[PDB]
Protein backbone atom coordinates (compact mmCIF):
# COMPACT_ATOMS: atom_id res chain seq x y z
CA UNK A 1 0.00 0.00 0.00
CA UNK A 2 1.12 3.59 -0.54
CA UNK A 3 2.58 5.72 2.26
CA UNK A 4 4.15 9.05 1.29
CA UNK A 5 4.11 8.03 -2.39
CA UNK A 6 6.23 5.01 -1.48
CA UNK A 7 5.20 1.36 -1.44
CA UNK A 8 5.16 -0.03 2.09
CA UNK A 9 4.11 -3.46 3.33
CA UNK A 10 0.97 -3.74 5.40
CA UNK A 11 -0.18 -6.76 7.33
CA UNK A 12 -3.76 -7.08 6.27
CA UNK A 13 -5.76 -8.96 8.80
CA UNK A 14 -7.58 -11.35 6.51
CA UNK A 15 -9.36 -12.91 9.43
CA UNK A 16 -11.42 -9.72 9.63
CA UNK A 17 -12.23 -10.07 5.96
CA UNK A 18 -13.42 -13.65 6.34
CA UNK A 19 -15.60 -12.72 9.30
CA UNK A 20 -16.97 -9.73 7.38
CA UNK A 21 -17.86 -11.87 4.38
CA UNK A 22 -19.29 -14.61 6.61
CA UNK A 23 -20.70 -13.06 9.82
CA UNK A 24 -22.43 -16.27 10.90
CA UNK A 25 -19.30 -17.95 12.24
CA UNK A 26 -19.30 -15.58 15.18
CA UNK A 27 -22.74 -16.58 16.36
CA UNK A 28 -21.91 -19.83 17.99
CA UNK A 29 -24.40 -22.07 19.64
CA UNK A 30 -23.30 -25.21 21.20
CA UNK A 31 -24.44 -27.43 18.34
CA UNK A 32 -22.82 -25.73 15.37
CA UNK A 33 -19.61 -27.49 14.39
CA UNK A 34 -22.06 -29.99 12.98
CA UNK A 35 -24.88 -28.05 11.28
CA UNK A 36 -25.09 -28.84 7.59
CA UNK A 37 -24.55 -25.40 6.22
CA UNK A 38 -22.08 -23.14 7.92
CA UNK A 39 -23.29 -20.10 6.04
CA UNK A 40 -26.73 -20.07 4.51
CA UNK A 41 -25.48 -17.52 2.01
CA UNK A 42 -22.46 -19.60 0.95
CA UNK A 43 -23.74 -23.09 1.19
CA UNK A 44 -20.91 -24.66 -0.75
CA UNK A 45 -18.28 -23.66 1.82
CA UNK A 46 -17.36 -26.57 4.00
CA UNK A 47 -13.80 -26.12 5.23
CA UNK A 48 -11.40 -23.17 5.36
CA UNK A 49 -7.73 -24.07 5.42
CA UNK A 50 -5.79 -21.50 7.40
CA UNK A 51 -2.08 -21.41 6.72
CA UNK A 52 0.22 -19.57 9.07
CA UNK A 53 3.59 -20.60 10.32
CA UNK A 54 3.18 -20.92 14.05
CA UNK A 55 6.62 -21.47 15.45
CA UNK A 56 5.48 -23.44 18.50
CA UNK A 57 7.04 -26.90 18.68
CA UNK A 58 3.85 -28.55 19.92
CA UNK A 59 1.52 -29.78 17.21
CA UNK A 60 -2.04 -28.50 16.96
CA UNK A 61 -4.91 -30.59 18.34
CA UNK A 62 -5.88 -33.21 15.68
CA UNK A 63 -9.46 -31.97 15.41
CA UNK A 64 -8.28 -28.76 13.70
CA UNK A 65 -5.38 -30.60 11.96
CA UNK A 66 -5.67 -32.77 8.83
CA UNK A 67 -3.82 -36.10 8.72
CA UNK A 68 -0.97 -35.79 6.28
CA UNK A 69 1.18 -38.77 7.31
CA UNK A 70 1.46 -42.53 6.85
CA UNK A 71 -0.54 -45.19 4.99
CA UNK A 72 -4.07 -44.03 4.36
CA UNK A 73 -5.36 -47.48 3.49
CA UNK A 74 -5.09 -51.23 3.82
CA UNK A 75 -5.63 -52.96 0.49
CA UNK A 76 -4.87 -50.27 -2.09
CA UNK A 77 -4.56 -46.50 -2.00
CA UNK A 78 -7.61 -44.86 -3.53
CA UNK A 79 -5.67 -42.20 -5.41
CA UNK A 80 -4.58 -44.64 -8.10
CA UNK A 81 -8.10 -46.04 -8.18
CA UNK A 82 -9.14 -42.45 -8.88
CA UNK A 83 -6.33 -41.51 -11.27
CA UNK A 84 -7.58 -44.10 -13.75
CA UNK A 85 -10.79 -42.09 -13.95
CA UNK A 86 -8.99 -38.82 -14.66
CA UNK A 87 -8.07 -37.54 -18.10
CA UNK A 88 -5.08 -35.31 -18.94
CA UNK A 89 -7.30 -32.64 -20.49
CA UNK A 90 -9.38 -32.24 -17.33
CA UNK A 91 -8.84 -28.61 -16.41
CA UNK A 92 -7.25 -28.13 -13.03
CA UNK A 93 -6.02 -24.60 -12.34
CA UNK A 94 -7.50 -21.17 -12.95
CA UNK A 95 -5.85 -17.81 -13.37
CA UNK A 96 -6.95 -14.24 -13.81
CA UNK A 97 -6.72 -12.37 -17.04
CA UNK A 98 -5.89 -8.74 -16.16
CA UNK A 99 -6.67 -7.88 -19.78
CA UNK A 100 -9.60 -10.18 -20.61
CA UNK A 101 -10.13 -10.97 -24.30
CA UNK A 102 -13.84 -10.34 -23.94
CA UNK A 103 -16.26 -9.39 -21.18
CA UNK A 104 -16.93 -13.08 -20.73
CA UNK A 105 -13.49 -14.59 -20.22
CA UNK A 106 -12.65 -13.88 -16.62
CA UNK A 107 -10.37 -16.62 -15.35
CA UNK A 108 -8.76 -18.63 -18.08
CA UNK A 109 -8.46 -22.25 -17.12
CA UNK A 110 -5.65 -24.76 -17.40
CA UNK A 111 -5.43 -28.56 -17.66
CA UNK A 112 -2.89 -31.26 -16.89
CA UNK A 113 -1.16 -31.33 -20.25
CA UNK A 114 -1.32 -27.57 -20.67
CA UNK A 115 0.81 -27.09 -17.57
CA UNK A 116 3.04 -30.10 -18.15
CA UNK A 117 3.79 -29.14 -21.74
CA UNK A 118 4.26 -25.48 -20.86
CA UNK A 119 6.87 -26.54 -18.35
CA UNK A 120 8.50 -29.03 -20.70
CA UNK A 121 8.58 -26.61 -23.63
CA UNK A 122 10.21 -23.97 -21.46
CA UNK A 123 12.66 -26.47 -20.00
CA UNK A 124 13.55 -27.80 -23.43
CA UNK A 125 13.85 -24.46 -25.21
CA UNK A 126 16.21 -22.66 -22.84
CA UNK A 127 18.22 -25.50 -21.68
CA UNK A 128 17.99 -27.20 -18.33
CA UNK A 129 20.23 -29.91 -16.94
CA UNK A 130 19.79 -31.81 -13.69
CA UNK A 131 20.68 -30.08 -10.41
CA UNK A 132 21.20 -26.73 -12.18
CA UNK A 133 19.70 -23.76 -10.36
CA UNK A 134 16.66 -22.04 -11.57
CA UNK A 135 15.28 -18.90 -9.92
CA UNK A 136 11.87 -17.23 -9.84
CA UNK A 137 11.00 -13.67 -8.93
CA UNK A 138 8.15 -13.63 -6.40
CA UNK A 139 4.47 -12.65 -6.79
CA UNK A 140 4.31 -14.61 -10.03
CA UNK A 141 2.23 -17.47 -8.63
CA UNK A 142 -0.98 -15.79 -9.85
CA UNK A 143 0.03 -15.64 -13.50
CA UNK A 144 1.43 -18.55 -15.43
CA UNK A 145 5.06 -17.78 -14.60
CA UNK A 146 5.78 -19.14 -11.14
CA UNK A 147 2.53 -21.11 -11.11
CA UNK A 148 2.91 -23.07 -14.34
CA UNK A 149 5.99 -22.48 -16.48
CA UNK A 150 8.62 -22.44 -13.71
CA UNK A 151 7.71 -25.21 -11.27
CA UNK A 152 6.71 -27.62 -14.02
CA UNK A 153 9.94 -26.79 -15.84
CA UNK A 154 11.70 -27.70 -12.62
CA UNK A 155 9.65 -30.88 -12.35
CA UNK A 156 9.75 -32.17 -15.90
CA UNK A 157 13.46 -31.86 -16.63
CA UNK A 158 15.77 -32.25 -13.66
CA UNK A 159 16.36 -28.84 -12.12
CA UNK A 160 16.26 -26.98 -8.85
CA UNK A 161 13.61 -24.30 -8.53
CA UNK A 162 14.63 -21.43 -6.28
CA UNK A 163 12.42 -18.90 -4.56
CA UNK A 164 13.92 -15.52 -3.77
CA UNK A 165 12.41 -13.35 -1.01
CA UNK A 166 8.64 -13.77 -0.50
CA UNK A 167 7.82 -10.43 -2.13
CA UNK A 168 9.37 -7.83 -4.47
CA UNK A 169 7.66 -4.43 -4.37
CA UNK A 170 9.94 -2.64 -1.81
CA UNK A 171 13.60 -1.52 -1.99
CA UNK A 172 14.68 -3.23 1.22
CA UNK A 173 13.68 -6.77 0.27
CA UNK A 174 14.75 -6.08 -3.29
Amino acid sequence: EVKQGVLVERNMHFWDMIYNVIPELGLSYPGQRFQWVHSQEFFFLKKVVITDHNMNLLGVTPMRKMLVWGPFSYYEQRLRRLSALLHPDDPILALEDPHPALEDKLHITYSHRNCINAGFLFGNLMGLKAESRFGVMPNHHVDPVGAIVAPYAALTTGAVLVHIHSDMFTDDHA
Binding site: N56, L57, L58, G59
Partner: protein, 319 residues
Protein backbone atom coordinates in the same frame (compact mmCIF):
# COMPACT_ATOMS: atom_id res chain seq x y z
CA UNK B 1 -1.39 16.27 61.56
CA UNK B 2 1.71 14.05 61.65
CA UNK B 3 0.95 11.13 64.00
CA UNK B 4 3.31 8.45 65.32
CA UNK B 5 2.62 4.72 65.66
CA UNK B 6 1.50 3.61 69.10
CA UNK B 7 2.73 0.11 70.06
CA UNK B 8 0.14 -2.42 71.21
CA UNK B 9 -0.25 -5.92 72.57
CA UNK B 10 -3.28 -8.16 72.13
CA UNK B 11 -4.81 -8.73 75.56
CA UNK B 12 -5.71 -12.26 76.74
CA UNK B 13 -9.49 -11.63 76.55
CA UNK B 14 -9.17 -11.10 72.78
CA UNK B 15 -6.80 -14.07 72.56
CA UNK B 16 -9.58 -16.59 73.17
CA UNK B 17 -11.29 -16.18 69.80
CA UNK B 18 -8.08 -17.52 68.29
CA UNK B 19 -7.94 -21.33 68.54
CA UNK B 20 -5.69 -22.77 71.24
CA UNK B 21 -3.51 -24.57 68.68
CA UNK B 22 -2.63 -21.27 66.96
CA UNK B 23 -2.88 -19.05 70.11
CA UNK B 24 0.91 -19.40 70.22
CA UNK B 25 1.48 -17.58 66.93
CA UNK B 26 -0.17 -14.18 67.40
CA UNK B 27 2.74 -11.85 68.21
CA UNK B 28 3.75 -9.74 71.22
CA UNK B 29 3.92 -6.30 69.61
CA UNK B 30 1.40 -4.70 67.29
CA UNK B 31 0.54 -1.12 66.39
CA UNK B 32 -2.37 1.26 65.86
CA UNK B 33 -1.85 4.53 63.98
CA UNK B 34 -5.45 5.69 64.05
CA UNK B 35 -7.28 6.54 67.25
CA UNK B 36 -9.95 3.94 66.37
CA UNK B 37 -9.51 0.52 64.73
CA UNK B 38 -12.87 0.16 62.99
CA UNK B 39 -14.42 -3.11 61.91
CA UNK B 40 -11.79 -3.24 59.16
CA UNK B 41 -8.65 -1.18 58.93
CA UNK B 42 -5.90 -0.74 56.49
CA UNK B 43 -3.42 -3.41 57.48
CA UNK B 44 0.21 -2.78 56.66
CA UNK B 45 2.75 -5.53 56.11
CA UNK B 46 6.49 -4.97 55.67
CA UNK B 47 9.88 -6.66 55.43
CA UNK B 48 11.18 -9.38 57.72
CA UNK B 49 11.31 -8.71 61.45
CA UNK B 50 14.11 -9.40 63.91
CA UNK B 51 12.99 -8.03 67.28
CA UNK B 52 11.03 -4.79 67.82
CA UNK B 53 13.91 -2.32 67.35
CA UNK B 54 13.57 -2.54 63.58
CA UNK B 55 9.78 -2.42 63.89
CA UNK B 56 9.77 1.01 65.53
CA UNK B 57 11.90 2.38 62.69
CA UNK B 58 9.91 0.57 59.98
CA UNK B 59 6.84 2.27 61.48
CA UNK B 60 8.10 5.74 60.61
CA UNK B 61 8.28 5.05 56.87
CA UNK B 62 4.54 4.53 56.64
CA UNK B 63 3.88 7.12 59.31
CA UNK B 64 3.87 10.05 56.85
CA UNK B 65 1.48 8.45 54.37
CA UNK B 66 -0.79 7.15 57.11
CA UNK B 67 -0.88 10.54 58.74
CA UNK B 68 -1.66 12.27 55.48
CA UNK B 69 -4.46 9.72 54.85
CA UNK B 70 -7.22 9.60 57.44
CA UNK B 71 -8.86 6.22 57.86
CA UNK B 72 -11.63 5.98 60.48
CA UNK B 73 -10.49 2.43 60.79
CA UNK B 74 -6.87 3.53 60.56
CA UNK B 75 -3.94 1.14 60.38
CA UNK B 76 -2.35 -1.89 62.04
CA UNK B 77 1.22 -3.10 61.56
CA UNK B 78 1.85 -6.83 61.67
CA UNK B 79 5.58 -7.70 61.80
CA UNK B 80 6.91 -10.89 60.17
CA UNK B 81 9.53 -13.21 61.65
CA UNK B 82 12.43 -13.83 59.29
CA UNK B 83 12.69 -17.62 59.49
CA UNK B 84 12.60 -20.84 61.49
CA UNK B 85 15.16 -23.62 61.21
CA UNK B 86 12.74 -26.33 62.39
CA UNK B 87 10.38 -26.48 59.42
CA UNK B 88 11.40 -26.07 55.78
CA UNK B 89 7.83 -25.19 54.80
CA UNK B 90 7.30 -23.04 57.93
CA UNK B 91 7.55 -19.50 56.54
CA UNK B 92 4.54 -18.51 54.45
CA UNK B 93 2.30 -20.73 56.59
CA UNK B 94 3.59 -19.16 59.79
CA UNK B 95 2.75 -15.77 58.32
CA UNK B 96 -0.62 -17.21 57.28
CA UNK B 97 -1.71 -18.41 60.68
CA UNK B 98 -0.16 -15.35 62.33
CA UNK B 99 -1.91 -12.69 60.26
CA UNK B 100 -5.22 -14.52 60.48
CA UNK B 101 -4.82 -15.05 64.23
CA UNK B 102 -4.37 -11.29 64.52
CA UNK B 103 -7.45 -10.73 62.37
CA UNK B 104 -9.41 -13.21 64.50
CA UNK B 105 -8.34 -11.52 67.75
CA UNK B 106 -9.31 -8.09 66.43
CA UNK B 107 -12.58 -9.51 65.10
CA UNK B 108 -11.66 -8.31 61.61
CA UNK B 109 -12.52 -9.86 58.26
CA UNK B 110 -12.58 -8.28 54.79
CA UNK B 111 -9.37 -6.26 54.98
CA UNK B 112 -7.40 -3.97 52.72
CA UNK B 113 -3.64 -4.62 52.72
CA UNK B 114 -0.53 -2.53 51.98
CA UNK B 115 2.95 -3.93 51.44
CA UNK B 116 6.26 -2.55 50.16
CA UNK B 117 8.02 -5.87 50.41
CA UNK B 118 7.99 -9.55 51.39
CA UNK B 119 4.57 -9.29 53.05
CA UNK B 120 2.96 -8.79 49.63
CA UNK B 121 4.17 -12.26 48.68
CA UNK B 122 2.51 -13.41 51.91
CA UNK B 123 -0.70 -11.56 50.93
CA UNK B 124 -0.67 -13.25 47.53
CA UNK B 125 -0.19 -16.48 49.46
CA UNK B 126 -3.36 -15.43 51.31
CA UNK B 127 -5.36 -14.76 48.16
CA UNK B 128 -3.71 -17.42 46.02
CA UNK B 129 -4.06 -20.12 48.63
CA UNK B 130 -7.47 -21.66 48.87
CA UNK B 131 -9.49 -21.21 52.10
CA UNK B 132 -7.73 -17.93 52.89
CA UNK B 133 -9.35 -15.63 50.31
CA UNK B 134 -12.24 -14.71 52.59
CA UNK B 135 -9.88 -12.76 54.85
CA UNK B 136 -8.16 -10.59 52.23
CA UNK B 137 -10.52 -8.02 50.76
CA UNK B 138 -8.00 -6.09 48.74
CA UNK B 139 -4.27 -6.40 48.23
CA UNK B 140 -2.29 -3.31 47.28
CA UNK B 141 1.39 -3.29 46.51
CA UNK B 142 3.43 -0.12 46.44
CA UNK B 143 6.26 -1.22 44.21
CA UNK B 144 6.49 -4.98 44.99
CA UNK B 145 6.54 -7.36 41.96
CA UNK B 146 4.37 -10.48 42.33
CA UNK B 147 5.16 -11.75 38.84
CA UNK B 148 7.66 -10.76 36.10
CA UNK B 149 7.66 -11.16 32.30
CA UNK B 150 10.55 -13.57 32.13
CA UNK B 151 8.81 -15.96 34.52
CA UNK B 152 5.76 -15.83 32.26
CA UNK B 153 7.61 -16.69 29.04
CA UNK B 154 10.04 -19.17 30.61
CA UNK B 155 7.25 -21.02 32.42
CA UNK B 156 5.15 -21.09 29.27
CA UNK B 157 8.10 -22.71 27.57
CA UNK B 158 8.52 -25.10 30.49
CA UNK B 159 4.93 -26.31 30.22
CA UNK B 160 5.22 -26.66 26.44
CA UNK B 161 8.56 -28.45 26.80
CA UNK B 162 7.00 -30.88 29.26
CA UNK B 163 4.20 -31.58 26.78
CA UNK B 164 6.72 -31.93 23.95
CA UNK B 165 8.92 -34.23 26.00
CA UNK B 166 5.89 -36.43 26.52
CA UNK B 167 4.94 -36.30 22.81
CA UNK B 168 6.85 -38.54 20.40
CA UNK B 169 5.82 -36.67 17.24
CA UNK B 170 7.92 -33.58 18.00
CA UNK B 171 11.32 -33.96 16.27
CA UNK B 172 14.59 -33.72 18.19
CA UNK B 173 15.64 -30.52 16.43
CA UNK B 174 12.84 -28.38 17.79
CA UNK B 175 13.02 -30.03 21.19
CA UNK B 176 16.78 -29.60 21.61
CA UNK B 177 16.50 -26.04 20.30
CA UNK B 178 13.76 -25.32 22.84
CA UNK B 179 15.92 -26.75 25.62
CA UNK B 180 18.87 -24.56 24.59
CA UNK B 181 16.39 -21.68 24.36
CA UNK B 182 15.37 -22.15 27.99
CA UNK B 183 18.96 -22.64 29.12
CA UNK B 184 19.92 -19.48 27.24
CA UNK B 185 17.49 -17.52 29.42
CA UNK B 186 17.32 -18.77 33.00
CA UNK B 187 15.06 -16.88 35.36
CA UNK B 188 16.69 -14.44 37.74
CA UNK B 189 14.69 -13.93 40.94
CA UNK B 190 12.22 -11.11 41.68
CA UNK B 191 13.61 -7.59 42.11
CA UNK B 192 13.66 -6.85 45.85
CA UNK B 193 12.47 -3.50 47.19
CA UNK B 194 13.73 -4.37 50.67
CA UNK B 195 17.19 -4.02 52.17
CA UNK B 196 16.69 -7.03 54.44
CA UNK B 197 14.78 -9.38 52.15
CA UNK B 198 17.51 -9.70 49.51
CA UNK B 199 19.19 -12.24 51.75
CA UNK B 200 15.76 -13.83 52.15
CA UNK B 201 15.14 -14.03 48.40
CA UNK B 202 18.60 -15.38 47.57
CA UNK B 203 18.80 -17.82 50.49
CA UNK B 204 15.28 -19.11 51.16
CA UNK B 205 12.86 -18.61 48.28
CA UNK B 206 14.68 -18.25 44.99
CA UNK B 207 18.03 -20.10 45.42
CA UNK B 208 18.74 -21.81 42.03
CA UNK B 209 19.89 -24.93 43.90
CA UNK B 210 16.27 -25.77 44.67
CA UNK B 211 13.50 -23.99 42.72
CA UNK B 212 14.35 -25.74 39.44
CA UNK B 213 15.41 -29.39 39.27
CA UNK B 214 16.83 -31.00 36.13
CA UNK B 215 18.01 -27.49 35.78
CA UNK B 216 15.96 -25.03 33.76
CA UNK B 217 13.29 -27.56 32.85
CA UNK B 218 11.24 -28.65 35.85
CA UNK B 219 10.64 -25.75 38.23
CA UNK B 220 9.21 -26.46 41.67
CA UNK B 221 7.70 -23.23 42.93
CA UNK B 222 5.82 -25.06 45.69
CA UNK B 223 8.00 -23.06 48.14
CA UNK B 224 6.36 -19.74 47.18
CA UNK B 225 3.41 -20.35 44.85
CA UNK B 226 2.94 -21.75 41.35
CA UNK B 227 1.90 -19.76 38.29
CA UNK B 228 -1.65 -21.11 37.97
CA UNK B 229 -2.52 -19.80 41.43
CA UNK B 230 -1.05 -16.40 40.60
CA UNK B 231 -3.07 -16.31 37.41
CA UNK B 232 -6.02 -17.59 39.42
CA UNK B 233 -6.45 -14.64 41.79
CA UNK B 234 -9.15 -12.17 40.88
CA UNK B 235 -8.88 -10.12 44.13
CA UNK B 236 -8.48 -6.52 43.07
CA UNK B 237 -4.77 -5.76 43.19
CA UNK B 238 -3.47 -2.26 42.63
CA UNK B 239 0.09 -1.59 41.60
CA UNK B 240 1.64 1.79 42.33
CA UNK B 241 4.22 3.06 39.82
CA UNK B 242 6.68 5.91 40.30
CA UNK B 243 6.70 8.21 37.23
CA UNK B 244 10.38 7.52 36.35
CA UNK B 245 12.43 4.27 36.21
CA UNK B 246 10.28 1.78 38.14
CA UNK B 247 10.28 -1.73 39.49
CA UNK B 248 7.24 -3.97 38.88
CA UNK B 249 6.70 -3.96 35.12
CA UNK B 250 2.94 -3.63 34.93
CA UNK B 251 2.57 -5.54 31.68
CA UNK B 252 2.95 -8.72 33.69
CA UNK B 253 0.59 -7.42 36.37
CA UNK B 254 -1.99 -6.53 33.76
CA UNK B 255 -1.61 -9.99 32.24
CA UNK B 256 -1.82 -11.93 35.49
CA UNK B 257 -3.95 -10.07 38.03
CA UNK B 258 -6.22 -8.47 35.42
CA UNK B 259 -6.59 -5.62 33.02
CA UNK B 260 -6.27 -2.59 35.24
CA UNK B 261 -3.78 0.21 34.64
CA UNK B 262 -1.43 0.63 37.61
CA UNK B 263 -1.88 3.89 39.48
CA UNK B 264 1.10 6.09 38.71
CA UNK B 265 2.35 8.59 41.29
CA UNK B 266 3.36 11.81 39.50
CA UNK B 267 5.47 13.31 42.30
CA UNK B 268 7.83 10.34 42.50
CA UNK B 269 10.60 9.68 40.04
CA UNK B 270 11.83 6.42 41.53
CA UNK B 271 10.99 4.49 44.69
CA UNK B 272 12.55 5.60 48.02
CA UNK B 273 10.89 8.84 46.98
CA UNK B 274 7.60 7.11 47.84
CA UNK B 275 8.20 7.41 51.58
CA UNK B 276 9.18 11.07 51.50
CA UNK B 277 6.41 13.45 52.56
CA UNK B 278 6.57 15.33 49.26
CA UNK B 279 4.82 12.48 47.31
CA UNK B 280 2.85 11.29 50.37
CA UNK B 281 -0.07 13.55 49.41
CA UNK B 282 -0.57 11.99 45.98
CA UNK B 283 0.03 8.46 47.30
CA UNK B 284 -2.50 8.88 50.08
CA UNK B 285 -4.86 10.45 47.55
CA UNK B 286 -4.66 7.31 45.41
CA UNK B 287 -4.95 5.07 48.47
CA UNK B 288 -8.03 6.89 49.72
CA UNK B 289 -9.65 6.90 46.29
CA UNK B 290 -9.05 3.15 46.13
CA UNK B 291 -10.37 2.53 49.66
CA UNK B 292 -13.64 4.36 49.14
CA UNK B 293 -14.55 2.22 46.15
CA UNK B 294 -15.22 -0.78 48.40
CA UNK B 295 -16.71 0.84 51.52
CA UNK B 296 -20.51 0.53 51.41
CA UNK B 297 -21.00 4.00 52.91
CA UNK B 298 -19.05 5.74 50.17
CA UNK B 299 -20.37 4.01 47.03
CA UNK B 300 -23.95 3.66 48.30
CA UNK B 301 -23.92 7.39 49.04
CA UNK B 302 -22.27 7.99 45.66
CA UNK B 303 -24.81 6.04 43.64
CA UNK B 304 -27.60 7.59 45.70
CA UNK B 305 -26.47 11.09 44.78
CA UNK B 306 -26.09 10.09 41.13
CA UNK B 307 -29.66 8.79 41.11
CA UNK B 308 -30.80 11.94 42.91
CA UNK B 309 -29.11 14.18 40.35
CA UNK B 310 -30.63 12.09 37.55
CA UNK B 311 -34.06 12.70 39.04
CA UNK B 312 -33.16 16.36 39.32
CA UNK B 313 -32.52 16.25 35.60
CA UNK B 314 -35.95 14.64 35.14
CA UNK B 315 -37.47 17.40 37.28
CA UNK B 316 -36.06 20.32 35.29
CA UNK B 317 -36.82 18.41 32.07
CA UNK B 318 -40.41 18.17 33.37
CA UNK B 319 -40.96 21.92 32.95
Amino acid sequence: QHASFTPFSIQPWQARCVGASRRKLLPQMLMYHGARLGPRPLIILDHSTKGEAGVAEAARKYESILSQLSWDYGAVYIPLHAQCTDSSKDLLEQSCQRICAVMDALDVRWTHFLTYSYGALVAVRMASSQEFPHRVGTLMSLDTPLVTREFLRNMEQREDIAKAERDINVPEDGLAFAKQALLSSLEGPLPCPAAEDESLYRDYLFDPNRIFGAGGLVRDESRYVPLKSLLGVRHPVQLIVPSANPLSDAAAHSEVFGHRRPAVVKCCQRHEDLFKESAAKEVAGVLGAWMRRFEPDCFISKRYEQAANEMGQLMLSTA
